[PDB]
Amino acid sequence: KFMVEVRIRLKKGMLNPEAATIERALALLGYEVEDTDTTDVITFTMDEDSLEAVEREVEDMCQRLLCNPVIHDYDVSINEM
Amino acid sequence: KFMVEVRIRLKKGMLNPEAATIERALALLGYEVEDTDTTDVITFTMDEDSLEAVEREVEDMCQRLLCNPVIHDYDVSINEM
């Protein structure tokens, strides 16, 4: 019924070990790239009675499982199938 | 009080995207390595009344949060501080 997509990205100012690791590795391989960042996208279908219930529920999953709002900025898009 | 360490590794036969990614990258950089694997270790202190409670609790955390026993083999070591 509902196609959900959650995008998770560390807030500005927050250290990104992977981003820093990739950037340095690239520099060493001879590639000059700046402002390297990483986003994690979780997609998944869900059955519900309404778009409203999916919203409050997905929001719950993000708060207690998918990410740490303290350090992560997240996006949630719900597309009805 | 208790120093806990949880080691998590995919069961034999299970695809390891990272392990496969690292191995191929290395081969390309000129390094011939075989049987590449990865282990995730989570360590953390915890206050308790007993070593027994920590054991049943840590076991719970692994079952519903730290890993997927279906595809992961895990180790749990508890050292009293």
Cβ atoms of B37 and B77 within 8 Å: the answer is no
3-state DSSP: chain A helix, strand, coil percent, rounded to 5? 35, 30, 35
Q: How far is CA B12 from the centre of its chain?
A: 14
Question: Which residues, other chains included, contact A71 with Cβ-Cβ below 8 Å and sequence gap of 6+?
Answer: A10, A11, A14
Identify whether the C-beta of residue A73 lies closer than 8 Å to the C-beta of residue A15.
no
Residue A12: burial class (beta carbons within 10 Å; 0-12, 13-18, 19+)? exposed
**Can you list the domains of chain B with their CATH numbers?**
1-81 (3.30.1280.10)
Dihedral-angle region of residue A35 (phi above 0 means left; psi in -120 to 50 means alpha; beta otherwise): left
The data reach a resolution, in angstroms, of 2.6
Experimental method of this PDB entry: X-ray
Distance, CA of B37 to CA of B16 (rounded, Å): 8
A73: helix, coil or strand? strand
